[PDB]
Every structure is written in C-alpha cells, then in structure tokens.
Amino acid sequence: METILEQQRRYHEEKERLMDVMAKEMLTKKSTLRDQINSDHRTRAMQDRYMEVSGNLRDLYDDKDGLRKEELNAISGPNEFAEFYNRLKQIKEFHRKHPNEICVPMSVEFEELLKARENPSEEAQNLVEFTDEEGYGRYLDLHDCYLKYINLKASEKLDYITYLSIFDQLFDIPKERKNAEYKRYLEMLLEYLQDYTDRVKPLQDQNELFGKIQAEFEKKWENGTFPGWEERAQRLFSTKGKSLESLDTSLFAKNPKSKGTKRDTERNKDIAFLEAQIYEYVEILGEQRHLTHENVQRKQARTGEEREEEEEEPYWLYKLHGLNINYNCEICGNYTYRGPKAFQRHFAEWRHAHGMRCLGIPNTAHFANVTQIEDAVSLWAKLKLQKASERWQPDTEEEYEDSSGNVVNKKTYEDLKRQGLL
Amino acid sequence: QDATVYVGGLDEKVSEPLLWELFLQAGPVVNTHMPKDRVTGQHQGYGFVEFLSEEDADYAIKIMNMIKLYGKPIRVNKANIFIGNLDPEIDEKLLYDTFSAFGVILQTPKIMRDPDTGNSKGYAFINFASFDASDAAIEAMNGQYLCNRPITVSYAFKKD
Amino acid sequence: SAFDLDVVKLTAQFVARNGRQFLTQLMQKEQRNYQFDFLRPQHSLFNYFTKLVEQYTKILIPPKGLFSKLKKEAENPREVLDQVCYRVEWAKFQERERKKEEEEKEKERVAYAQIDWHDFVVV
Ligand SMILES: [Zn+2]
C-alpha cells in the first residue's frame, strides 16, 4: 500500500475539503442563535476530525525515511511499475462507474435545504446539550443552584436576586464559611459553569484555556495573587494573613499548611481550584450572567399572562339515456359506473385493465360483463385448463423408442430419450 | 413510445404511406401517423412510425438520421437568444457544442417540443454568458448554413 | 472507471519520482509496447492526470510530512479558523472582482450598442 504517496495525498485532500467546508460555513450569514450554535458545533467537529486526520497522517513517516532511498532511485522504475500494471490487469467485466472518489467527501461535508447539518453531524442536536431555559447560550439556568443554596443554608430569607448578588462577587467576602459544606455546592456550580462556558463557544480551544487557567492558578494564585498595601498577603487555602513575603514563603512549607489542618494544600486544593475556575467563568461570562439577571428581573416584574407569553415563545334525457341506474364493479375499486352505455364500455377502458392486471389476468372479450373477483379467477382457471389442454405439447405428448433395446420400450417420453442417449 | 420512432423534417412530397415505404427497409413498420394542422389541414413536418420491435426503431433512428428526404432534413428519434428553423437531427449537447465555437454557454440549452409528439417543435432558446456572445451569434450564427436548414438567431427580449 | 483512475494514479505516482522533465518512468514505458493514452495532452483525462501529478509533487514537499511535522494546522484551531477566514475573504474578493468584470462587460455592451455604425471612414 502507498502509505506515503496515496494516503498522505488523501489526508491532504480531506484536510483541504474540511478547510473549504469551514470557509463556506464561515462565509455564510447567520439569522438565528440556535442555527449559529449548531454551525459552530459542526465546525468544531470538522476541526476535530481534521486534527485527528492530521495526527494520523503525521505518524506515517517512519517507513518513509527508509523507502525514500528506493523511491527516488532512477536505476529502478518501470519493472515494478510493469509488475503493478500486470497486477492491475485483471478482468474488467465489472461495468460500473464510480464518480464518488472525490465527490463523496464533498457531499459528506455539505448540508441540505431541509436540514442544515453535515453527514457526520446528522445526529447532532442542540436540545441534547442545552436546556430550554438557557436559550442555546443566551442565558444560564440558576434555579437549581438557588434551590441547592437555599437547602444548604436552611433558610427561606434568600430570593433569586439575593443569590444573584451573592454570586456576582469575585474577590469579596464569602456569604458562608470556606470550611463548611458550601464548598461541595460551589464545586458543582463551578462544574456547571465550566460546561456552560464550553457550550457557549465550541469553536474555542478548551484545552488551551484550561492549561492557561491551570498555569494562572499554579504560578500566580498559589504565590500571592492579591497583594495589599495581615493585609499585605492573603492565602486562599489557609485563610490567614502574612507580615511579609519572606514570612509567607516560610509558612508555605509549614506543617499545618501542608497537611496539618482541615483546609490545607493537600485536601483543600481541589476546592480552591474549583473556586478559581468559578471565578474565571464569572469573569469570562459576566455578560451572560447580566443577561440572565435581566431576564430574571423581567420575568419577576411581568404578570402571569406576560410570563405565559414569554414561556410560550333535460332531466328527461337523465332517465331516457339510462342515467339514475348505477352499476358497480369490484375489479374496479368498487367504482360505481352510470347508465349501461358507459358501464359496458368500462371493461375496455384503462381503469378496468389496471384492476385486472392486479390479479394477473389479461383483458379479453371473455372477461366482459364480469365484475366480481372470484368469478374472474375461476373463469381464468377454466380458460387456462381449456387452452392448455387443446394445444400440442410435444414434450409430454410424443412416442419415442430409444435404441437401448431398439426393439422394445416405446413408452419413452421426449425427456427420457435424451437421458438414455446422453 | 419505445417501439415508435418520431420523424422530423418532412416536406410536402412526403406522405403517410411514403414514410412507411421508406422505413420498410429498416424494419417492420406497422403503422404511420401524421398529425394534421387546424389552419392549413396538412402535416406540420413531424410524424410517427410505430414498428413491431424496438430494435427496428433503433436501427431506423441510427440509419435515417440527418437524411435529405424531399429536400428536407428528415431525422428519426426515440419518441436571451431564440433560434428558429432548426434541424431536428441535432440534440441539446450538439447545440451546446455548436454554440461553444462562438461564445461560452451559461448552462445546458433547451429546445421546444410539441405537446403531441414531443420530438421537435421548430424553435429553441439558448442563453449566453455575456452580450458579446449574443452579438456574435446575431452577426455570424444568425444566417449560418446548418445541416440542410437555414436557422435564424434573434434576441428574445430587448429594451429600447 | 476505477481501473482507469487507478492507472492514472499509478502513472502520477511513477512520474513524480523523476529527476528530469523527459527522463521519467512513463516515457520509457511508451516505447516498451505499453499502451497509455493518458500521456498525450489531447485527451480530457490528461487535465486530471496533471492535477494528480501536481498533488503527488505536493505530497513530496518537506512540510508535507516527509521530514517535518505540521504544528499550526494540527495543534491550533485558531490558525485553522484564521485560514478559513482568509479563504472566505479571498472568495469574497474574487466574487467582487467577478461582479466588477460583469459590470465592465455590461458597460462595454451598452457603449457598443449605442455608437453610430454609419459614420464610415476609409483612410
Ligand atoms: Zn370494472
């Protein structure tokens, strides 16, 4: 197999087709947010497929460095080419043209008029990744988080506006203790906010953003990211102040700070990372949180009907010529025909021939004035028997006397004679 | 329709038994049909020959194609620019290849057909890429010697 | 049409490894009693065979995957998005140039159909 010649060119053609499909998707205008989110998800899937194809093609270079000495040699050539042509010299009886060598990846990376989705992305749906209250990235669902916060706080003195004001803080004082059970709800709220940020922009590099967030949490947040003018340096895990930078560096490797506490850097590192991720998601998606707060205020200020509307978004010839007397035929869909002059003519017309073909019986003068099915099939059996009888069938009707005994056995049919003479 | 062959380009010398006698050497032509006009009461140049087998109709279409019968381009077939008095022996691909020498064609051309026979009406419509190809067709192709039929190219729509 | 496409792909793979324009693995095969009608430029398949030979020559580039590894197209979606935006801008510029050429052709057709063709002067 030509893995360096044919497979690399096929991977390059697939990458060029994916880039052309991405350019055609980016050049087309958008009219709705859900269709734009679906197009962005399809472009992200096509970019992931192109990255996988490039990673598969980039690993096919180990044998190429060994085969380049034999491929670039001018001493070789038409011997192996003539051997491959003799291998390609098989029977050409498969008379079938295949124009889908390059047209099939072009049609797989395209959409239809009824549904604007690609062929690998035909099973993708925007309702399986986002809820109806989010609006495909327009707002964020915070009713379940507010219910969980009200269940954890064990008090009914916190509304949605108070929860939105408590969630709007980034570096202020927290509402509850850092070593309490609110961190288990904050980690779930951060894991939901990370999925909401990854769903609001599928075309952005999530791995590079996660690596940048991890680098900012390790190199900056773990080394005093909030300087002061106890107020000079504050620790997120130990929740205590520091006199200077040397005292904080000496206390960073201390025994209560490493593992000798309940909020040290060994056990409470994941909660601090989740809090940093929640702060980064609140700083990156503050406009979506403000839009969700404005939508919640508009839903609270509205009435019941406004909220329902927001959630819903020659009579003599008649009897002289034969009319008023109707006849029906089962062979013709129980089609009821009018006066006899038309009824007698219908057997020759198209509809009756069609109805008769359904059973497989030809239209002849024998099957006239016959309107029922079973009568037709019985008369067809009769006519078949009659005609088949009255013909001359030489196969069963013939007297051969084979030369096996040559003076006996004249009861041989026309088939046993061939079997004896074979 | 498969066993019958539609003949186009018949003059006044050709008749209904004459086409059956001329098509008798190609195959067993069972019947001949000639639609008469309403204003003149004669044949419009297009007729049909219903044979017994489809192979005889295929041989008549492959043998009597673009023939000069009665001083007319008779041809048998399987039954903004305006071109008139065109020969029925040419197809859409043949007209596209003939129009490709003057200018570039935007798409595949279409030829008008009769509602009864459906082989050839007599006029066709073709669209060019620009007005220069239309002017070259009105200067050169409007009057060129086609296959035994003087065609006439004209503008379909023009604004004064 | 699979056998002819495979023969054209084999000819494009054997002709891309040549060290000269006429000293290839297909010019000597023509004198070796091997019928190959796709080598002549008069056939319509020669335009596809030339594109296949160009793709085989572009598959032998040093950034094509022979002695180097691509990092921008394989490990950066933002570079691919910028390349797609540049391709869309180039397609929009080509469409604008085609519209300008069509407008110039319409202006030339309007000027040619309005000039006086009766003022003839033979010098
Ligand atoms: Zn009936």
CB contact under 8 A, C105 and B130: yes
Ramachandran region, residue A383 (left: φ > 0; alpha: ψ -120 to 50; beta: rest): alpha
Q: Which of C13, C58, C55 is nearest to A71 (CA)?
A: C13
Three-state SS at B18: helix
**CA pair distance A326, A336, nearest whole angstrom:** 6
CB atoms near residue A367 (< 10 Å):
19
Three-state SS at A231: coil
Q: Which two tokens stand for residue A111?
A: 């959409």
Question: Which residue is it, tokens 């008369």?
Answer: A379
Q: Which two tokens stand for residue A324?
A: 């008023």
Q: Which of A290, A317, A312, A316 is nearest to A302 (CA)?
A: A312
Q: How far is CA B80 from the centre of its chain?
A: 20
Q: Which of A407, A343, A396 is nearest to A369 (CA)?
A: A343
CA distances from A387 to A119, A390, A391, B123 (A): 59, 5, 6, 55
List the Cα angle A347/A353/A359 in 5-degree steps: 115
Indicate the angle between helix axes A286-301 and A304-312, nearest 10 degrees: 130
A343 Cα: distance to centroid of ligand 1 (angstroms): 8
CA distances from A176 to A166, A241, B129 (A): 10, 19, 75
In sequence order, the 6+-apart residues with CB closer than 8 A to the CB of A57 are A7, A8, A11, A12, C65
CB contact under 8 A, B132 and C109: yes
Q: Extract the runs of DSSP E, i.e. beta strands, from A308-399.
A: 327-329, 335-337
Q: With 0-12 CB in 10 A as exposed, 13-18 as middle and 19+ as buried, what is B12?
A: exposed
CB contact under 8 A, A19 and C80: yes
CB atoms near residue A77 (< 10 Å):
17
CA distances from A343 to A257, A339, A347, A365, C40 (A): 105, 6, 8, 15, 71
DSSP annotation of B51? E
Experimental approach was cryo-EM
Neighbouring subunits of A (3+ Cβ pairs under 8 A): C
CA distances from C21 to A71, A75, A348, C17 (A): 17, 16, 76, 11
DSSP annotation of B37? P
Q: Which two tokens stand for residue B138?
A: 């009105």
CB atoms near residue B89 (< 10 Å):
22
CB atoms near residue A14 (< 10 Å):
18
**CA pair distance A246, A396, nearest whole angstrom:** 118
B and A touch per CB criterion (3+ pairs under 8 A) = no
Q: Which residues pair with B29 in a beta bridge?
A: B51
A314 Cα: distance to centroid of ligand 1 (angstroms): 28
Task: Judge whether A118 and A108 are in contact, CB under 8 Å.
Answer: yes
**CA pair distance A384, A360, nearest whole angstrom:** 13
Q: How far is B2 from chain C (nearest CA, A)?
A: 29
Q: Which two tokens stand for residue C55?
A: 């793709």
Three-state SS at B145: strand
Q: Which of B60, B18, B10, B61 is nearest to B36 (CA)?
A: B10
Scan residues 72-91 of A and list those with Cβ closer than 8 Å to C: 72, 74, 77-78, 81-82, 84-85, 88
The amino acid present at C22, given as its one-letter code, is: F
In sequence order, the 6+-apart residues with CB closer than 8 A to the CB of A33 are A135, A136, A137, A138
**CA pair distance A251, A244, nearest whole angstrom:** 11
Q: How far is CA A1 from the centre of its chain?
A: 32
CB contact under 8 A, B135 and C106: no
Long-range contacts of A303-308 (CB under 8 A, 24+ apart): none
Three-state SS at A4: coil
| Closest chain C CA to residue B134 | C109
**CA pair distance B109, B93, nearest whole angstrom:** 8
**CA pair distance C11, C49, nearest whole angstrom:** 8
List the Cα angle B81/B84/B85 in 5-degree steps: 155
Q: Which residues pair with B36 in a beta bridge?
A: B43
Scan residues 123-142 of B and list those with Cβ closer than 8 Å to C: 130-132, 135
A320 Cα: distance to centroid of ligand 1 (angstroms): 23
Residue A165 C-beta-side C-alpha neighbours within 13 Å: 6
The secondary structure element, H or E, covering residue B49 is strand B46-51
CA distances from A158 to A163, A223, A294, A299, A303 (A): 7, 35, 18, 18, 22
- Tell me how far apart the 2 most distant CA atoms of chain B are, in Å: 56
Task: Judge whether B9 and B86 are in contact, CB under 8 Å.
Answer: no
Measure the CA dihedral A198/A283/A34/C73, to 10°.
-50
**Resolution in angstrom units:** 2.7
B69 φ, ψ to 5°? Answer: -110, 120
Q: Which of A43, A49, A42, A62 is nearest to A11 (CA)?
A: A49
- Tell me how far apart the 2 most distant CA atoms of chain A are, in Å: 135
In sequence order, the 6+-apart residues with CB closer than 8 A to the CB of A330 are A371, A372, A373
Q: Which of B160, B88, B150, B100 is nearest to B126 (CA)?
A: B100
Task: Judge whether B76 and B16 are in contact, CB under 8 Å.
Answer: no
With beta carbons under 8 A apart, name residues in chain A contacting C28. 77-78
Helix, strand, coil percentages, rounded to 5, for chain B: 20, 30, 50
Sign of the alpha-carbon torsion through A123, A124, A130, A136: negative
Neighbours of ion ligand 1 (CB under 5 A): A 329, 331-332, 352
DSSP characters over C29-76: HHTTT---TTSSTTSTTHHHHHHHHHHHHHTTSIIIIIS----TTTS-
A316 Cα: distance to centroid of ligand 1 (angstroms): 27
Residue C8 C-beta-side C-alpha neighbours within 13 Å: 22
CA distances from A182 to A69, A150, A160 (A): 67, 11, 17
CB contact under 8 A, B132 and C106: no
- Strand ranges across the sheet with B110-111: B110-111, B123-126, B81-84, B152-155
DSSP annotation of A77? -
Q: Which of A23, A64, A85 sits opposite C66 (nearest CB)?
A: A64
**CA pair distance A163, A140, nearest whole angstrom:** 14
The two beta strands, B72-78 and B81-84, are unpaired
Terminus-to-terminus CA distance in chain B, angstroms? 46
Q: Which residues pair with B74 in a beta bridge?
A: B67
Q: Which of C99, C104, C109, C110 is the best substitution to test chain B (most B C-beta atoms within 10 A)?
A: C109
Task: Judge whether A19 and C87 are in contact, CB under 8 Å.
Answer: yes
Any A CB within 8 A of C17 CB: yes
